[PDB]
Design a protein around this ligand. Structure first.
Ligand SMILES: Nc1ncnc2c1ncn2[C@@H]1O[C@H](COP(=O)(O)OP(=O)(O)O)[C@@H](O)[C@H]1O
Ligand SMILES: Nc1ncnc2c1ncn2[C@@H]1O[C@H](COP(=O)(O)OP(=O)(O)O)[C@@H](O)[C@H]1O
Ligand SMILES: Cc1cn([C@H]2CC[C@@H](COP(=O)(O)O)O2)c(=O)[nH]c1=O
Ligand SMILES: Cc1cn([C@H]2CC[C@@H](COP(=O)(O)O)O2)c(=O)[nH]c1=O
Ligand SMILES: [Mg+2]
Ligand SMILES: [Mg+2]
Ligand SMILES: [Mg+2]
Lengths: 209, 209
């Protein structure tokens, strides 16, 4: 009885990391086997390169950094498949959607080019998109100092995310992340419980193919 | 007056490295500005990861290692473009063709998936393919100990190379690499002199797009 693959995507400070952490806690407390994953996974050799880039400690050519971001996902595929096959549900803070939206926001990068490197990855059974108005997000303190943390770029990435949500091959669910931490959590949790039950009667799919 | 981008591809021990070295020497001696590049370029952070993999010092997931091999090309694109624009001809020992043929030889990797990461790279003005019969190649000592150095794999990669040569968007030239070092060199050199003159009246192209 395989686990589900649940990905959390969304606007800056919408609460991806907070709701991913809380969801795995809630699932486990409800007797599911569940574990948390995040992308980029900064602990591998490729992950370190990406971390240094996001911190402006190094500069990486745009195409190369996009392929590293996808290679960082592929290096976890054997683990992902093994865990799901063992019945472990995986909650993932960012996935290939962030990869296409962040590079796709840069000048001269088509959405088709950006998607290719991730074609074939495990397909999520559920892709939550945490929505939030900037007036609301701004009250979530201030922009960080990492790369991409400015409003003009974030707004181009959102545009790309909206192009990705047109793809009906995927189970997108919008979440109103303007509510309190606990109210957004409850919305997410119920969607997740439904996906772990049903979504899983079908074999794990392949993304964008 | 831009330089030309000349790539050398070919079967194992066909003489890519030897003919690339000799060609840049010959061009320079004939008053051209020319420089040698090779892929993988093992000196970068990504290059080190690839080198360790090819030496069996580390194991890398197939998809991830293919994307690193393409990221290794993209990190040299700013240099490549700068050099060609300055009138420097670049001779390249292996390029994206080796990347698609080597991964494309593994089970379950389409040629289309394999090409995508390199779509957009600078397009070579001339792609020499050094051909050699194994009876002849075998007399070129023995297989190395790096990954992919066995006859069954090499034969699957050759198959992929032959699919790539069907692509007429590219200036493929076959070279009979069974001749002596100097005779193969002379063939290569004359093809290269023709490409540097003519091929260059047109702007640098984009690969596979
Ligand atoms: N629903 C929410 N309401 C108010 N603050 C929130 C909410 N969710 C997260 N926060 C706070 O906003 C900040 C960003 O949340 P985080 O989960 O890191 O976002 P993301 O990973 O999407 O950038 C953190 O300080 C977090 O505690
Ligand atoms: N035309 C040739 N005839 C005989 N030996 C050759 C020829 N070209 C290369 N060699 C030898 O064969 C070996 C492989 O050549 P090399 O250029 O390293 O090949 P590749 O880079 O294609 O593996 C080297 O020992 C080289 O000196
Ligand atoms: C997974 C991934 C992410 N990104 C960016 C988005 C924000 C930053 C991570 O930071 P936080 O998750 O801490 O916001 O990294 C990319 O550009 N490409 C990708 O493939
Ligand atoms: C450029 C490139 C090369 N390769 C392999 C082919 C042989 C080995 C290099 O070794 P030699 O060039 O020393 O033969 O690396 C790939 O698998 N993918 C690629 O993108
Ligand atoms: Mg976060
Ligand atoms: Mg396509
Ligand atoms: Mg060589």
């Amino acid at each position: 009885r395989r686990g589900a693959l649940i990905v959390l995507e969304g606007v800056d400070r919408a609460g991806k990391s907070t709701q991913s952490r809380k969801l795995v806690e809630a699932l486990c407390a409800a007797g599911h086997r569940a574990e948390l994953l995040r992308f980029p996974e900064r602990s591998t050799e490729i992950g370190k390169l990406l971390s240094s880039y996001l911190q402006k400690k190094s500069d990486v050519e745009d195409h190369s950094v996009h392929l590293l971001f996808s290679a960082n996902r592929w290096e976890q595929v054997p683990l992902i498949k093994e865990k799901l096959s063992q019945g472990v549900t995986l909650v993932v803070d960012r996935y290939a959607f962030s990869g296409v939206a962040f590079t796709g926001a840069k000048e001269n990068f088509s959405l088709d080019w950006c998607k290719q490197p991730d074609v074939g990855l495990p397909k999520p059974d559920l892709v939550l998109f945490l929505q939030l108005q900037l007036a609301d997000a701004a009250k979530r303190g201030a922009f960080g100092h990492e790369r991409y943390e400015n409003g003009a770029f974030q707004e181009r990435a959102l545009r790309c995310f909206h192009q990705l949500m047109k793809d009906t091959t995927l189970n997108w669910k919008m979440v109103d992340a303007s509510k309190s931490i606990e109210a957004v959590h409850e919305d997410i949790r119920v969607l997740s419980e439904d996906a772990i039950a049903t979504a899983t009667e079908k074999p794990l799919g392949e993304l964008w193919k």
